[PDB]
Tab-separated table of N, CA and C in Angstrom:
chain	number	residue	atom	x	y	z
A	8	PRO	N	87.169	91.639	91.176
A	8	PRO	CA	87.491	90.834	89.985
A	8	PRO	C	88.807	90.079	90.157
A	9	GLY	N	89.916	90.822	90.262
A	9	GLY	CA	91.216	90.235	90.550
A	9	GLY	C	91.670	90.443	92.000
A	10	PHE	N	90.758	90.870	92.885
A	10	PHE	CA	91.105	91.084	94.283
A	10	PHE	C	89.940	90.688	95.191
A	11	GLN	N	90.255	90.408	96.463
A	11	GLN	CA	89.249	90.290	97.506
A	11	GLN	C	89.618	91.216	98.663
A	12	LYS	N	88.593	91.682	99.386
A	12	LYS	CA	88.780	92.428	100.625
A	12	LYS	C	88.192	91.596	101.759
A	13	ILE	N	89.017	91.256	102.758
A	13	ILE	CA	88.583	90.399	103.850
A	13	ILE	C	88.432	91.267	105.095
A	14	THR	N	87.199	91.368	105.610
A	14	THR	CA	86.944	92.114	106.827
A	14	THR	C	87.601	91.365	107.980
A	15	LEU	N	88.394	92.079	108.783
A	15	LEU	CA	89.072	91.474	109.917
A	15	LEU	C	88.247	91.641	111.193
A	16	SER	N	88.384	90.655	112.081
A	16	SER	CA	87.808	90.709	113.413
A	16	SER	C	88.696	91.551	114.330
A	17	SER	N	88.084	92.424	115.139
A	17	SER	CA	88.814	93.257	116.085
A	17	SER	C	89.534	92.435	117.161
A	18	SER	N	89.251	91.124	117.258
A	18	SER	CA	89.886	90.278	118.256
A	18	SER	C	91.160	89.625	117.705
A	19	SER	N	91.468	89.858	116.420
A	19	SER	CA	92.617	89.240	115.783
A	19	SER	C	93.875	90.082	116.015
A	20	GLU	N	95.023	89.400	116.003
A	20	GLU	CA	96.339	90.026	116.032
A	20	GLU	C	96.478	90.994	114.856
A	21	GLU	N	96.059	90.543	113.671
A	21	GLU	CA	96.252	91.296	112.439
A	21	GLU	C	95.518	92.637	112.509
A	22	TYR	N	94.259	92.604	112.951
A	22	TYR	CA	93.487	93.822	113.090
A	22	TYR	C	94.208	94.774	114.044
A	23	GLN	N	94.645	94.246	115.194
A	23	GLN	CA	95.157	95.086	116.265
A	23	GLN	C	96.526	95.664	115.909
A	24	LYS	N	97.287	94.985	115.051
A	24	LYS	CA	98.556	95.520	114.578
A	24	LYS	C	98.311	96.745	113.697
A	25	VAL	N	97.331	96.646	112.795
A	25	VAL	CA	96.988	97.764	111.938
A	25	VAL	C	96.415	98.910	112.774
A	26	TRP	N	95.519	98.564	113.701
A	26	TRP	CA	94.856	99.532	114.553
A	26	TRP	C	95.903	100.303	115.347
A	27	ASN	N	96.904	99.579	115.849
A	27	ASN	CA	97.966	100.195	116.632
A	27	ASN	C	98.642	101.325	115.850
A	28	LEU	N	98.975	101.070	114.584
A	28	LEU	CA	99.689	102.051	113.770
A	28	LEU	C	98.841	103.307	113.547
A	29	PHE	N	97.535	103.118	113.303
A	29	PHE	CA	96.594	104.211	113.105
A	29	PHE	C	96.491	105.054	114.382
A	30	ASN	N	96.354	104.356	115.507
A	30	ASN	CA	96.139	104.961	116.810
A	30	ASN	C	97.364	105.744	117.281
A	31	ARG	N	98.549	105.475	116.720
A	31	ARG	CA	99.735	106.231	117.105
A	31	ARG	C	99.518	107.734	116.936
A	32	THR	N	98.773	108.153	115.896
A	32	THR	CA	98.599	109.577	115.656
A	32	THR	C	97.137	110.020	115.544
A	33	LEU	N	96.162	109.099	115.520
A	33	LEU	CA	94.743	109.448	115.527
A	33	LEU	C	94.021	108.720	116.657
A	34	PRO	N	94.494	108.867	117.915
A	34	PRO	CA	93.829	108.244	119.054
A	34	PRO	C	92.429	108.797	119.335
A	35	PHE	N	92.137	110.008	118.834
A	35	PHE	CA	90.889	110.701	119.127
A	35	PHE	C	89.830	110.420	118.055
A	36	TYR	N	90.174	109.649	117.016
A	36	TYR	CA	89.194	109.162	116.049
A	36	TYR	C	88.869	107.701	116.346
A	37	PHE	N	87.839	107.167	115.676
A	37	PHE	CA	87.331	105.838	115.970
A	37	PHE	C	87.328	104.973	114.718
A	38	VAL	N	88.081	103.864	114.778
A	38	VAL	CA	88.172	102.921	113.670
A	38	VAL	C	86.905	102.068	113.680
A	39	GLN	N	86.276	101.926	112.505
A	39	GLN	CA	84.998	101.246	112.368
A	39	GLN	C	85.169	99.934	111.609
A	40	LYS	N	86.171	99.843	110.721
A	40	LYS	CA	86.360	98.648	109.920
A	40	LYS	C	87.788	98.608	109.387
A	41	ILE	N	88.378	97.403	109.355
A	41	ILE	CA	89.663	97.161	108.708
A	41	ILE	C	89.515	95.932	107.823
A	42	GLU	N	89.913	96.090	106.556
A	42	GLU	CA	89.869	95.029	105.564
A	42	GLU	C	91.269	94.737	105.039
A	43	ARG	N	91.604	93.450	104.927
A	43	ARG	CA	92.828	93.005	104.284
A	43	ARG	C	92.595	92.916	102.782
A	44	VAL	N	93.496	93.526	102.005
A	44	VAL	CA	93.378	93.503	100.559
A	44	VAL	C	94.211	92.342	100.042
A	45	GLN	N	93.588	91.481	99.235
A	45	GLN	CA	94.280	90.360	98.628
A	45	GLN	C	94.201	90.525	97.117
A	46	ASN	N	95.320	90.947	96.509
A	46	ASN	CA	95.438	90.998	95.063
A	46	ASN	C	96.712	90.252	94.676
A	47	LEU	N	96.558	89.012	94.189
A	47	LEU	CA	97.700	88.155	93.917
A	47	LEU	C	98.621	88.798	92.882
A	48	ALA	N	98.038	89.445	91.861
A	48	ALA	CA	98.813	90.034	90.784
A	48	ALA	C	99.699	91.158	91.308
A	49	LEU	N	99.122	92.065	92.108
A	49	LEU	CA	99.885	93.167	92.679
A	49	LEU	C	100.935	92.635	93.654
A	50	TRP	N	100.624	91.530	94.332
A	50	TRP	CA	101.530	90.938	95.306
A	50	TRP	C	102.747	90.318	94.615
A	51	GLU	N	102.504	89.581	93.525
A	51	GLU	CA	103.582	88.971	92.761
A	51	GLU	C	104.543	90.037	92.238
A	52	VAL	N	104.001	91.117	91.680
A	52	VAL	CA	104.798	92.207	91.138
A	52	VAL	C	105.657	92.820	92.249
A	53	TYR	N	105.020	93.125	93.376
A	53	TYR	CA	105.683	93.755	94.512
A	53	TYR	C	106.835	92.885	95.019
A	54	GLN	N	106.603	91.576	95.137
A	54	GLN	CA	107.621	90.692	95.693
A	54	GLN	C	108.796	90.558	94.725
A	55	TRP	N	108.499	90.528	93.419
A	55	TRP	CA	109.536	90.556	92.402
A	55	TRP	C	110.359	91.836	92.494
A	56	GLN	N	109.680	92.987	92.599
A	56	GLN	CA	110.349	94.269	92.696
A	56	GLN	C	111.263	94.293	93.925
A	57	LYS	N	110.769	93.783	95.053
A	57	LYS	CA	111.544	93.730	96.283
A	57	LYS	C	112.827	92.921	96.075
A	58	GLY	N	112.691	91.770	95.402
A	58	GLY	CA	113.821	90.904	95.097
A	58	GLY	C	114.836	91.612	94.203
A	59	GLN	N	114.346	92.364	93.202
A	59	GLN	CA	115.239	93.043	92.280
A	59	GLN	C	115.972	94.164	93.016
A	60	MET	N	115.257	94.885	93.888
A	60	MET	CA	115.848	95.986	94.625
A	60	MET	C	116.907	95.461	95.600
A	61	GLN	N	116.666	94.283	96.176
A	61	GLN	CA	117.645	93.678	97.076
A	61	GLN	C	118.940	93.394	96.325
A	62	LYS	N	118.818	92.812	95.133
A	62	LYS	CA	119.991	92.512	94.330
A	62	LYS	C	120.751	93.788	93.997
A	63	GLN	N	120.006	94.854	93.681
A	63	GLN	CA	120.620	96.096	93.258
A	63	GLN	C	121.160	96.893	94.438
A	64	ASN	N	120.898	96.410	95.656
A	64	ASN	CA	121.353	97.038	96.884
A	64	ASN	C	122.520	96.243	97.478
A	65	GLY	N	123.354	95.666	96.608
A	65	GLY	CA	124.465	94.845	97.049
A	65	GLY	C	123.999	93.612	97.818
A	66	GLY	N	122.763	93.171	97.553
A	66	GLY	CA	122.198	91.966	98.146
A	66	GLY	C	121.629	92.185	99.550
A	67	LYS	N	121.468	93.441	99.965
A	67	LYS	CA	121.009	93.782	101.306
A	67	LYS	C	119.514	94.103	101.290
A	68	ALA	N	118.848	93.842	102.423
A	68	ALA	CA	117.416	94.038	102.550
A	68	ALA	C	117.077	95.481	102.190
A	69	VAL	N	115.931	95.622	101.536
A	69	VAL	CA	115.388	96.878	101.058
A	69	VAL	C	114.633	97.569	102.193
A	70	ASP	N	114.778	98.891	102.338
A	70	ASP	CA	113.967	99.663	103.280
A	70	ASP	C	112.501	99.543	102.844
A	71	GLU	N	111.703	98.865	103.684
A	71	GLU	CA	110.306	98.564	103.422
A	71	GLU	C	109.497	99.060	104.617
A	72	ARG	N	108.442	99.832	104.352
A	72	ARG	CA	107.669	100.439	105.427
A	72	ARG	C	106.178	100.223	105.197
A	73	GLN	N	105.421	100.343	106.296
A	73	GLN	CA	103.974	100.363	106.250
A	73	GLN	C	103.553	101.812	106.457
A	74	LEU	N	102.946	102.377	105.406
A	74	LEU	CA	102.707	103.806	105.312
A	74	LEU	C	101.250	104.041	104.904
A	75	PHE	N	100.704	105.206	105.296
A	75	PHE	CA	99.305	105.519	105.076
A	75	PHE	C	99.110	106.327	103.793
A	76	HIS	N	97.901	106.195	103.243
A	76	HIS	CA	97.516	106.919	102.038
A	76	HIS	C	96.034	107.253	102.122
A	77	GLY	N	95.737	108.553	102.249
A	77	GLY	CA	94.366	108.994	102.386
A	77	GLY	C	93.620	108.747	101.083
A	78	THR	N	92.342	108.384	101.190
A	78	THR	CA	91.561	108.074	100.010
A	78	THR	C	90.124	108.510	100.259
A	79	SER	N	89.259	108.126	99.324
A	79	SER	CA	87.824	108.213	99.492
A	79	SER	C	87.242	106.840	99.196
A	80	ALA	N	86.102	106.550	99.816
A	80	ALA	CA	85.450	105.261	99.673
A	80	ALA	C	85.256	104.894	98.202
A	81	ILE	N	84.972	105.880	97.342
A	81	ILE	CA	84.633	105.572	95.956
A	81	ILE	C	85.845	105.063	95.167
A	82	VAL	N	87.074	105.416	95.563
A	82	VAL	CA	88.236	105.034	94.766
A	82	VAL	C	88.920	103.773	95.314
A	83	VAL	N	88.420	103.219	96.428
A	83	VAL	CA	89.049	102.070	97.074
A	83	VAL	C	89.203	100.893	96.109
A	84	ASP	N	88.103	100.461	95.475
A	84	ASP	CA	88.116	99.262	94.645
A	84	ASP	C	89.039	99.418	93.433
A	85	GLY	N	89.147	100.636	92.891
A	85	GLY	CA	90.061	100.936	91.799
A	85	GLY	C	91.526	100.735	92.200
A	86	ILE	N	91.868	101.178	93.415
A	86	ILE	CA	93.209	101.005	93.950
A	86	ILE	C	93.482	99.527	94.226
A	87	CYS	N	92.510	98.807	94.801
A	87	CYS	CA	92.676	97.389	95.101
A	87	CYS	C	92.960	96.558	93.846
A	88	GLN	N	92.441	97.032	92.707
A	88	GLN	CA	92.558	96.348	91.425
A	88	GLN	C	93.818	96.778	90.670
A	89	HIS	N	94.076	98.096	90.600
A	89	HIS	CA	95.059	98.687	89.700
A	89	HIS	C	96.269	99.282	90.427
A	90	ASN	N	96.200	99.376	91.762
A	90	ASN	CA	97.229	100.012	92.578
A	90	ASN	C	97.027	101.527	92.599
A	91	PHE	N	97.797	102.185	93.469
A	91	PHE	CA	97.822	103.630	93.598
A	91	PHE	C	98.305	104.302	92.311
A	92	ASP	N	97.835	105.531	92.079
A	92	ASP	CA	98.224	106.294	90.901
A	92	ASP	C	98.087	107.776	91.227
A	93	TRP	N	99.188	108.528	91.136
A	93	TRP	CA	99.210	109.906	91.600
A	93	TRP	C	98.332	110.823	90.739
A	94	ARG	N	98.030	110.411	89.512
A	94	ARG	CA	97.378	111.337	88.591
A	94	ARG	C	95.871	111.082	88.571
A	95	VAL	N	95.382	110.241	89.492
A	95	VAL	CA	93.958	110.166	89.781
A	95	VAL	C	93.591	111.310	90.731
A	96	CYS	N	94.327	111.404	91.847
A	96	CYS	CA	93.912	112.160	93.023
A	96	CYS	C	94.680	113.483	93.140
A	100	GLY	N	100.179	118.437	99.306
A	100	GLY	CA	100.137	119.911	99.348
A	100	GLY	C	101.457	120.523	98.885
A	101	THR	N	102.486	120.397	99.729
A	101	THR	CA	103.846	120.738	99.349
A	101	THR	C	104.401	119.580	98.529
A	102	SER	N	104.969	119.884	97.353
A	102	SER	CA	105.370	118.842	96.421
A	102	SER	C	106.864	118.524	96.551
A	103	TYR	N	107.119	117.226	96.692
A	103	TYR	CA	108.438	116.634	96.677
A	103	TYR	C	108.563	115.716	95.467
A	104	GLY	N	107.728	115.971	94.451
A	104	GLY	CA	107.793	115.268	93.185
A	104	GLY	C	106.419	114.783	92.739
A	105	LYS	N	106.327	114.437	91.451
A	105	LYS	CA	105.092	113.991	90.834
A	105	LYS	C	105.036	112.468	90.901
A	106	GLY	N	104.715	111.988	92.108
A	106	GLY	CA	104.486	110.578	92.361
A	106	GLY	C	103.420	110.405	93.431
A	107	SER	N	103.194	109.154	93.834
A	107	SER	CA	102.229	108.822	94.861
A	107	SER	C	102.838	109.090	96.240
A	108	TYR	N	102.040	109.694	97.132
A	108	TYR	CA	102.489	110.138	98.442
A	108	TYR	C	102.034	109.130	99.497
A	109	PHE	N	102.963	108.756	100.402
A	109	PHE	CA	102.657	107.845	101.491
A	109	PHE	C	103.247	108.413	102.775
A	110	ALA	N	102.460	108.368	103.860
A	110	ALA	CA	102.827	109.027	105.105
A	110	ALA	C	103.158	108.043	106.226
A	111	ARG	N	104.143	108.435	107.046
A	111	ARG	CA	104.421	107.724	108.278
A	111	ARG	C	103.182	107.746	109.174
A	112	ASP	N	102.558	108.922	109.291
A	112	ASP	CA	101.499	109.152	110.261
A	112	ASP	C	100.123	109.132	109.594
A	113	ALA	N	99.182	108.391	110.188
A	113	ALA	CA	97.793	108.410	109.755
A	113	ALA	C	97.212	109.823	109.815
A	114	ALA	N	97.599	110.618	110.812
A	114	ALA	CA	97.079	111.974	110.956
A	114	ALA	C	97.408	112.837	109.738
A	115	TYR	N	98.572	112.606	109.104
A	115	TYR	CA	98.923	113.322	107.883
A	115	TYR	C	97.955	112.924	106.764
A	116	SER	N	97.792	111.609	106.568
A	116	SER	CA	96.899	111.084	105.546
A	116	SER	C	95.457	111.546	105.750
A	117	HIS	N	95.048	111.691	107.016
A	117	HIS	CA	93.719	112.179	107.317
A	117	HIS	C	93.496	113.555	106.691
A	118	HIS	N	94.530	114.398	106.691
A	118	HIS	CA	94.413	115.714	106.084
A	118	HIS	C	94.120	115.607	104.582
A	119	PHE	N	94.560	114.542	103.911
A	119	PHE	CA	94.340	114.426	102.473
A	119	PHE	C	93.284	113.364	102.147
A	120	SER	N	92.381	113.107	103.098
A	120	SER	CA	91.339	112.103	102.942
A	120	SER	C	89.994	112.793	102.718
A	121	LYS	N	89.487	112.706	101.482
A	121	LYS	CA	88.378	113.535	101.031
A	121	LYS	C	87.046	112.897	101.424
A	122	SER	N	86.258	113.672	102.176
A	122	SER	CA	84.915	113.304	102.581
A	122	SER	C	84.131	114.573	102.923
A	123	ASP	N	82.808	114.522	102.746
A	123	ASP	CA	81.942	115.614	103.164
A	123	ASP	C	81.257	115.258	104.484
A	124	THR	N	81.671	114.138	105.097
A	124	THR	CA	81.107	113.696	106.361
A	124	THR	C	82.238	113.396	107.340
A	125	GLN	N	81.860	112.934	108.538
A	125	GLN	CA	82.815	112.609	109.581
A	125	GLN	C	83.495	111.266	109.312
A	126	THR	N	82.994	110.497	108.333
A	126	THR	CA	83.515	109.175	108.029
A	126	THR	C	84.530	109.260	106.888
A	127	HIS	N	85.730	108.704	107.128
A	127	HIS	CA	86.820	108.757	106.170
A	127	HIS	C	87.373	107.352	105.946
A	128	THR	N	88.179	107.240	104.888
A	128	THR	CA	88.865	106.011	104.544
A	128	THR	C	90.340	106.328	104.289
A	129	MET	N	91.243	105.425	104.703
A	129	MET	CA	92.629	105.495	104.258
A	129	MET	C	93.158	104.080	104.074
A	130	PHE	N	94.198	103.961	103.239
A	130	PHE	CA	94.923	102.710	103.103
A	130	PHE	C	96.109	102.692	104.065
A	131	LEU	N	96.441	101.490	104.537
A	131	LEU	CA	97.806	101.176	104.931
A	131	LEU	C	98.430	100.396	103.781
A	132	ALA	N	99.582	100.852	103.295
A	132	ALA	CA	100.217	100.217	102.152
A	132	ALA	C	101.602	99.735	102.563
A	133	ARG	N	102.055	98.657	101.921
A	133	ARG	CA	103.423	98.211	102.061
A	133	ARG	C	104.227	98.908	100.966
A	134	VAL	N	105.318	99.581	101.351
A	134	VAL	CA	106.049	100.449	100.436
A	134	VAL	C	107.543	100.138	100.487
A	135	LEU	N	108.116	99.858	99.308
A	135	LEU	CA	109.554	99.701	99.148
A	135	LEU	C	110.160	101.082	98.932
A	136	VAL	N	110.500	101.765	100.034
A	136	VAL	CA	111.026	103.112	99.916
A	136	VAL	C	112.480	103.070	99.448
A	137	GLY	N	113.204	101.990	99.768
A	137	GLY	CA	114.583	101.839	99.325
A	137	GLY	C	115.437	103.015	99.800
A	138	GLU	N	116.342	103.482	98.948
A	138	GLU	CA	117.190	104.606	99.306
A	138	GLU	C	116.514	105.905	98.875
A	139	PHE	N	116.198	106.775	99.847
A	139	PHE	CA	115.461	108.002	99.592
A	139	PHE	C	116.393	109.210	99.598
A	140	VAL	N	115.895	110.289	98.992
A	140	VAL	CA	116.597	111.551	98.815
A	140	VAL	C	115.519	112.618	98.925
A	141	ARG	N	115.881	113.830	99.349
A	141	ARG	CA	114.908	114.899	99.415
A	141	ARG	C	114.364	115.205	98.019
A	142	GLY	N	113.040	115.358	97.952
A	142	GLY	CA	112.332	115.606	96.715
A	142	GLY	C	112.305	117.085	96.348
A	143	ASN	N	111.687	117.339	95.201
A	143	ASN	CA	111.659	118.638	94.562
A	143	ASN	C	110.411	118.645	93.688
A	144	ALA	N	109.740	119.801	93.617
A	144	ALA	CA	108.472	119.933	92.916
A	144	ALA	C	108.587	119.509	91.452
A	145	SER	N	109.785	119.640	90.871
A	145	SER	CA	109.985	119.412	89.447
A	145	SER	C	110.348	117.961	89.138
A	146	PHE	N	110.546	117.124	90.166
A	146	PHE	CA	110.954	115.748	89.928
A	146	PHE	C	109.798	114.932	89.352
A	147	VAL	N	110.083	114.205	88.264
A	147	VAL	CA	109.120	113.276	87.692
A	147	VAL	C	109.603	111.850	87.932
A	148	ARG	N	110.784	111.727	88.553
A	148	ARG	CA	111.346	110.452	88.949
A	148	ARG	C	112.386	110.792	90.011
A	149	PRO	N	112.895	109.828	90.805
A	149	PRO	CA	113.971	110.136	91.744
A	149	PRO	C	115.199	110.539	90.941
A	150	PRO	N	116.010	111.486	91.447
A	150	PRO	CA	117.241	111.886	90.765
A	150	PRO	C	118.339	110.832	90.858
A	151	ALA	N	119.372	111.020	90.027
A	151	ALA	CA	120.550	110.179	90.062
A	151	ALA	C	121.544	110.787	91.045
A	152	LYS	N	122.372	109.935	91.652
A	152	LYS	CA	123.509	110.387	92.432
A	152	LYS	C	124.538	111.020	91.494
A	153	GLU	N	125.363	111.918	92.040
A	153	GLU	CA	126.455	112.521	91.275
A	153	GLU	C	127.336	111.452	90.624
A	154	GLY	N	127.709	111.677	89.348
A	154	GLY	CA	128.595	110.787	88.607
A	154	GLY	C	127.846	110.011	87.518
A	155	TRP	N	128.501	109.753	86.377
A	155	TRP	CA	127.798	109.248	85.202
A	155	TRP	C	127.345	107.799	85.392
A	156	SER	N	126.082	107.544	84.991
A	156	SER	CA	125.384	106.262	85.076
A	156	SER	C	125.523	105.648	86.471
A	157	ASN	N	125.500	106.517	87.484
A	157	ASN	CA	125.531	106.088	88.870
A	157	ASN	C	124.116	105.673	89.270
A	158	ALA	N	123.975	105.182	90.507
A	158	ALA	CA	122.700	104.763	91.062
A	158	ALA	C	121.705	105.918	91.049
A	159	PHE	N	120.429	105.552	90.896
A	159	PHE	CA	119.311	106.441	91.140
A	159	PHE	C	118.732	106.048	92.503
A	160	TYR	N	118.095	107.007	93.159
A	160	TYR	CA	117.334	106.734	94.367
A	160	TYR	C	116.049	105.983	94.029
A	161	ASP	N	115.383	105.482	95.078
A	161	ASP	CA	114.187	104.672	94.930
A	161	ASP	C	112.911	105.438	95.257
A	162	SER	N	113.061	106.549	95.982
A	162	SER	CA	111.951	107.354	96.432
A	162	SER	C	112.468	108.735	96.824
A	163	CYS	N	111.540	109.675	96.962
A	163	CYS	CA	111.828	111.000	97.480
A	163	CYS	C	111.098	111.198	98.800
A	164	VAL	N	111.643	112.085	99.652
A	164	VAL	CA	111.078	112.378	100.962
A	164	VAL	C	111.085	113.884	101.202
A	165	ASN	N	110.327	114.303	102.222
A	165	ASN	CA	110.346	115.683	102.683
A	165	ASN	C	111.643	115.991	103.441
A	166	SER	N	112.196	114.979	104.117
A	166	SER	CA	113.375	115.126	104.972
A	166	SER	C	114.132	113.805	105.059
A	167	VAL	N	115.428	113.829	104.720
A	167	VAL	CA	116.236	112.621	104.770
A	167	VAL	C	116.485	112.199	106.220
A	168	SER	N	116.668	113.174	107.118
A	168	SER	CA	117.002	112.850	108.497
A	168	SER	C	115.758	112.446	109.291
A	169	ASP	N	114.575	112.913	108.880
A	169	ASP	CA	113.358	112.596	109.615
A	169	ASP	C	112.193	112.475	108.640
A	170	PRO	N	112.176	111.430	107.789
A	170	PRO	CA	111.194	111.337	106.712
A	170	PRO	C	109.814	111.008	107.264
A	171	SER	N	108.831	111.813	106.876
A	171	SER	CA	107.456	111.566	107.279
A	171	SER	C	106.533	111.427	106.071
A	172	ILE	N	107.020	111.831	104.888
A	172	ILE	CA	106.299	111.703	103.631
A	172	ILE	C	107.238	111.066	102.614
A	173	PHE	N	106.737	110.062	101.884
A	173	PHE	CA	107.501	109.353	100.873
A	173	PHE	C	106.768	109.444	99.544
A	174	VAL	N	107.526	109.758	98.491
A	174	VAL	CA	107.000	109.865	97.143
A	174	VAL	C	107.554	108.713	96.321
A	175	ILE	N	106.631	107.939	95.733
A	175	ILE	CA	106.940	106.749	94.966
A	175	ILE	C	106.540	106.990	93.517
A	176	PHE	N	107.435	106.663	92.594
A	176	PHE	CA	107.182	106.958	91.190
A	176	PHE	C	106.949	105.691	90.373
A	177	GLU	N	107.022	104.527	91.021
A	177	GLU	CA	106.904	103.244	90.359
A	177	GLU	C	105.882	102.406	91.125
A	178	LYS	N	104.752	102.073	90.503
A	178	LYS	CA	103.687	101.333	91.170
A	178	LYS	C	104.189	99.998	91.725
A	179	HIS	N	105.208	99.418	91.081
A	179	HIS	CA	105.709	98.110	91.473
A	179	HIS	C	106.299	98.128	92.881
A	180	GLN	N	106.550	99.324	93.425
A	180	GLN	CA	107.113	99.497	94.758
A	180	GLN	C	106.047	99.593	95.845
A	181	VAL	N	104.759	99.387	95.520
A	181	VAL	CA	103.698	99.534	96.509
A	181	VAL	C	102.735	98.357	96.416
A	182	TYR	N	102.228	97.934	97.578
A	182	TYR	CA	101.167	96.954	97.655
A	182	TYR	C	100.084	97.525	98.566
A	183	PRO	N	98.828	97.692	98.092
A	183	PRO	CA	97.772	98.239	98.942
A	183	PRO	C	97.292	97.127	99.866
A	184	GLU	N	97.536	97.294	101.164
A	184	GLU	CA	97.509	96.166	102.073
A	184	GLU	C	96.211	96.133	102.881
A	185	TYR	N	95.797	97.287	103.430
A	185	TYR	CA	94.626	97.357	104.292
A	185	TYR	C	93.810	98.601	103.971
A	186	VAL	N	92.488	98.454	104.078
A	186	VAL	CA	91.556	99.559	103.972
A	186	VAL	C	91.018	99.829	105.376
A	187	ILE	N	91.152	101.071	105.846
A	187	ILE	CA	90.707	101.472	107.175
A	187	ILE	C	89.600	102.513	107.033
A	188	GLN	N	88.445	102.209	107.621
A	188	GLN	CA	87.349	103.155	107.713
A	188	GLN	C	87.245	103.640	109.156
A	189	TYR	N	87.115	104.961	109.336
A	189	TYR	CA	87.082	105.567	110.661
A	189	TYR	C	86.186	106.809	110.649
A	190	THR	N	85.811	107.275	111.845
A	190	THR	CA	85.028	108.489	112.016
A	190	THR	C	85.728	109.495	112.934
A	191	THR	N	85.505	110.784	112.647
A	191	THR	CA	86.030	111.872	113.455
A	191	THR	C	85.033	112.275	114.543
A	192	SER	N	83.876	111.609	114.582
A	192	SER	CA	82.876	111.878	115.607
A	192	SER	C	83.420	111.545	117.004
């Protein structure tokens, strides 16, 4: 309705860039399809959010990453339209949407009763992160009154592999990847 999914050719740069990231940690699985998600509304919001975060970061570029999110085929179109939402879908670093450095992590949270799975690659404004906590419903504030708040939570500040996002405006669902464990 407000989005399109464009199937990419395996001979394209774009396909192979996405494939490369997946293959970093799931070389033993087989990618069957990659689709580019085009949602102008979600894109406009995301780019605005990025601009606002840059201003609030003393005018410096925002930490922005391409991160994986395990899904199921049935919820793909809902995400493409409305964005990710944590209260639709292990160790908790807060009550937000989880995004992983590694596809292999996302594979663990990708629900299927068959060998065929789906995950997103998403563009994520992680900004300034802090270690999360099961009780967090938003990123905490830094010490001191009306000081800065963080932008995301992580499992580890020194070696972050999981990012928790509490604001949909910080995510753009970029690619849908279908693969098999066969």
